[PDB]
Amino acid sequence: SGRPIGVVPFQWAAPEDIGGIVAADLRNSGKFNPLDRARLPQQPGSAQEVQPAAWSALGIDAVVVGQVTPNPDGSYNVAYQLVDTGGAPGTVLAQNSYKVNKQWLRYAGHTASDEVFEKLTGIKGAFRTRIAYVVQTNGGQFPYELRVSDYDGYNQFVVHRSPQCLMSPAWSPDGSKLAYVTFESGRSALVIQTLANGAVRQVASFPRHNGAPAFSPDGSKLAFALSKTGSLNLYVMDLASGQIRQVTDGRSNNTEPTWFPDSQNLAFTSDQAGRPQVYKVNINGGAPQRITWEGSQNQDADVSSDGKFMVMVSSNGGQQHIAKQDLATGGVQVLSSTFLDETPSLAPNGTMVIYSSSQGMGSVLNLVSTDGRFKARLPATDGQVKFPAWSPYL
Amino acid sequence: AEIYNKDGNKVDLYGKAVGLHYFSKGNGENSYGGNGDMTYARLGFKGETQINSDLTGYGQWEYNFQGNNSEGADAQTGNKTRLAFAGLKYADVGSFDYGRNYGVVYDALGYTDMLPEFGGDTAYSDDFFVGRVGGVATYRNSNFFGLVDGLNFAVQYLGKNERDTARRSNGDGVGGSISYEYEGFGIVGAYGAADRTNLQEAQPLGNGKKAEQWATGLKYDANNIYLAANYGETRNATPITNKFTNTSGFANKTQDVLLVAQYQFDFGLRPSIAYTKSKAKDVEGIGDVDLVNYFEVGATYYFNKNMSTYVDYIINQIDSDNKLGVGSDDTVAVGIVYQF
Amino acid sequence: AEIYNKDGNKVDLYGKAVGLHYFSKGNGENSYGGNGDMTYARLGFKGETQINSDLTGYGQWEYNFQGNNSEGADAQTGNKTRLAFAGLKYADVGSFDYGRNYGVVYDALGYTDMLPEFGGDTAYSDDFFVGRVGGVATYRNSNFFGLVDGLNFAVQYLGKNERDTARRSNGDGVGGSISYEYEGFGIVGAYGAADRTNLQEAQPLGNGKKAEQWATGLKYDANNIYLAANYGETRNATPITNKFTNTSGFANKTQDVLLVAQYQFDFGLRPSIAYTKSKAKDVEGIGDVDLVNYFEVGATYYFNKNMSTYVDYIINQIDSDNKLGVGSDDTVAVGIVYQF
Amino acid sequence: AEIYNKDGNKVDLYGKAVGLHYFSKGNGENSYGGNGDMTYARLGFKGETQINSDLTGYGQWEYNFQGNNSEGADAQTGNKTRLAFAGLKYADVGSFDYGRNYGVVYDALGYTDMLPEFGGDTAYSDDFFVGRVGGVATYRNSNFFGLVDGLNFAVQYLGKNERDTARRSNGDGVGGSISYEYEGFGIVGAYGAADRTNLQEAQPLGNGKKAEQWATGLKYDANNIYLAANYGETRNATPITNKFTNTSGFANKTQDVLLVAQYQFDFGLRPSIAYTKSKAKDVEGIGDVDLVNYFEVGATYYFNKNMSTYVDYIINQIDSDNKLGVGSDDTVAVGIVYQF
């Protein structure tokens, strides 16, 4: 399902397949169904060349065409136009053109992807965003790498190598830093590393476990979990002052905090009621309220950017899967169907979830659209991949 | 088979069972090999671990248990530990090991020792350098520090062993061996020299202290073919026994010549041919005599790597009047083998 | 347990440990079984490989190590290799093996040898066809080429073995055995004949050359129950020792009767009962006498396949005045077993 | 290494190979330890199975094979089975095992026996409670049913063993041991008592029936450090031999003192020092004498868990005039080890 759309190969072998990137982007959202290349009624190289009747016959009311041309300085011009083939046939609804170096051809494609999607949905595009994750390679000395890549698995790079565990990265709202757990010192610590220069800020090294950092959406605070009290509980640091306040206090285990859009409430996982469930608490007035009553288990939550829903790992009758819970009704919809579904992270527009599974025996991340309509494997890495985290808008 | 390959450590348990029988005219006293049931099972373990990228350590051990024996007092007869050693492999300089292992000269004598059952009689065990012995320290170089491909050399020191019998005893010894393999062709040369202990001198046969062995080997193996020719000479090193006198000792001088030609087929078949000869000289009271002089004609069907069958017919050319009570009778052997 | 199952090859290392003890009045000279600690561990490996769809090859070996011995000179006492053979199983025609294995007559005698520790006394080891011996070549047919289900037969040739003692020696022999299993019931009949060596004839007891054994077995096994009755007769085959004369040899004639009845429970329990008797006739100077005459009463708890405990009380009915110094005392045994 | 972990059952094959050598002045008759190559390989299997959540059963067996021996009649010399037992561990009440295992007193004497090759001389084998013996039934409690952490106790019964030699024989015995480990520190106390057999009493040396052993141990191990001090006293328990008289027996009284101090480094190194002493009293015709009195100075480099090298220099302080023909010479040993 999804809205059918025509994505035509771009006018030029070309250094990169931009039309294929646009099709893949629109498809990954769940909101679009780019027409199979083998069933395109034509390959117009321009809006004038578009024959609307031939697309409307197939139920397509819009067509993406474009051009890639080489520049004398070795850069490339990438341009796209979106042509109405429905109620206003032949009208151009949107278009753009821009110059990129070969290594930014995908970004040029991603640029086109962002605007057409928004034109057709009114939703800001998230195809130029990034994911962070931890890769275990087969190297001996530094088996742990914190890496970042494009959402679709291309353009991978290494951000830091470490001989010890990293987990649960979280982006600053400006996209400039990653928080993470490091054992480089010999025990657990929470640190914030600035990506642009690789500088590492040390955040916390309390007794026992230091884990599960999260940046507030407004950028002022860092939430995380300490078990110094005897069990895991949530704490918040004011990043400007460095002062830490305690939010939860109890014998239960409390971890995996996520921020609500208001930068004042957290969702988190608790065993206070026995099996894991998701709770909500204000970072000031502390008294957790259970919000999950369907199924038998819910955990590892991430609240949407409008706060209207959340995604999480839910267990109902033996099966653990990525699920979505509407926060004002209790209606639960299962999104994923893979095995060992873990560590979900939402795109900044709430339209896609990246997560880890048994796919590739751990070596592959998966995407699932939050409408449930699209699922895919990311390109395989050379190691075990865990703890994905979808960047904010970039 | 590799049973454990984890934690940068790998263990390969390798063991086999052999249902074997020897036939020959008569009771088998004079038969080359013998007669009857010779079934036996061997068990062993090899292990490696890469301590560093450029440094790894390995340990290997093998034991042989014979099944032909009865359950009475003779149950343990023929049961022993063949190999038990360890060592480390550096990246390029080479590798150094210590324990109970084959002597350098065995490296040269390996080319001829390709027969299914018989063969390698000259490579006696617990002998100075020809067979597997305990108390050796060996250094080995592969491709001369990686300088020249296919040319490798080894050096070996032999700690003295004072045992009850001169047959099993020795003293301080040294030896070396070099092997160049090029384009299928192979050449080798090994030399070993050691001093005989007082117990050894006490033997009626044999004279002198310097027990010396050396050997040269040539071969070509490829395209399902294997040719080999080892010529070795020794002084006061080879054991000899006289049934008429019921007295033993060593040979003042010995020359040995071995030749093998085996073909292999795609359908798990390998006919083999081997000529052999050994003449001892300056024997005390026996002058010069031939210890072994025979032809081989045999074959082996290889069902797979883990299953095989074989046969060997030994045409013993030794005469009955031989001056050492040696078996002057032909022989044959038929064997079946499972091995993991 | 299966340690290697790859490349159409499978290896099953099977081994166990048994903490055992024997009790009886007195030191245990006159006790049926003995007295003291009888802890022992057995190790063995079985291996198969499907060479072709219709042809597979197998090799099996087992050894027994005794723990009752000390660390001094007697460490190896009682340590031996029980089974060591190989062979191939064709699809339907049958299977043929060779090595050190049980004799065809053991196939019949298996029904009675279901006891925890004692039992199968008639199936002595290194005896002609009743127990496990070295130098046998056996062919077996399953379901008569797959024609008739449950009816299977085996044939066995026994190469002569000239050992130091008449107890462990034999000569050329042949034998056969057939077993028909129908609806849980089981029937078997086995016969073996061989020639005694000169050492055997030279023994004071025993007379004649054709050493003959044969046996018939019946059983019903189902519903956690196992009934069995084996009657076997032999000539110049069973070994016998006279403490009064301190002389051994063979029995001109022997009849043996074995009866077993064992029940099994869901909760890892298996009570057992066994009657046994053996009468020798035409003994040189002793007429007819009873070698063994006893009842069994025992039990076994099966914690799981890998763990078990058991007990057995042997009511020896043999009298002290028996003319062969046989033990006229009762006995008991208690054992615990771990096995992988 | 763990080779089979399935069906709630787990098997750990553990084995190692050791290329070893002993140096000393002279042939090595008078050397503390000896002289020459002492390479040996040990193989063993451990097995567990959780029958229930609160009840599991285990079986373990170990054997040692020596490589220093030749391939002749002496191949099996020094080859033996060290441990072979089984038993079950309940959740909290405790655990009960039986077989061939270390005596309770070994628990106390374990603190000193941390040396690479030498050490634990007082803990003789096939001795009443100090070393590994066959026919023991042991019960053990960990942390006193989980009541008090770090405090565990064990009790052991020893079935009588009537062997050919008093050195390897024993009788009914009992023993107990308690060990409290707190925050790294450790304290232990063990006591054992048994009756000597007629052969032991019949020995020229030794007098009395009650063979008694007991020991107390203290230690601290942490921060890559290990300090230990065991003091044990025994009556008619320690074996003793007189070369001048070439006669053996047991010691009417014996005091033994052991002290160990070893440091460990992050880079796979562990230097060691050990003092030791044993004085026998009320010896028949020799009054009181010192059996062993020496210093240790040694080290061990750990390449990894599976590979290691080590050296040990034993400063034997025993004088030549010792009244038992004891070796009054120093000694040294150098070893290399692979282990899976």
Next chain:
Amino acid sequence: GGDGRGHNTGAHSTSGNINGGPTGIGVSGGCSDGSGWSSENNPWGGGSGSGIHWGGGSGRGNGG
């Protein structure tokens, strides 16, 4: 006979080991949630030492 088959001269080695590390080969994760099972669980181990001790110590009582 048959000893020559295989039996490489020179140094002795067969194939690549599964993992790099001499003593530390596993899969991944450190910082532990104490859960014993989750994605933030480090050990990924169980049935640690269920079996009883078997003569702890070197055990070389006298000497080979």
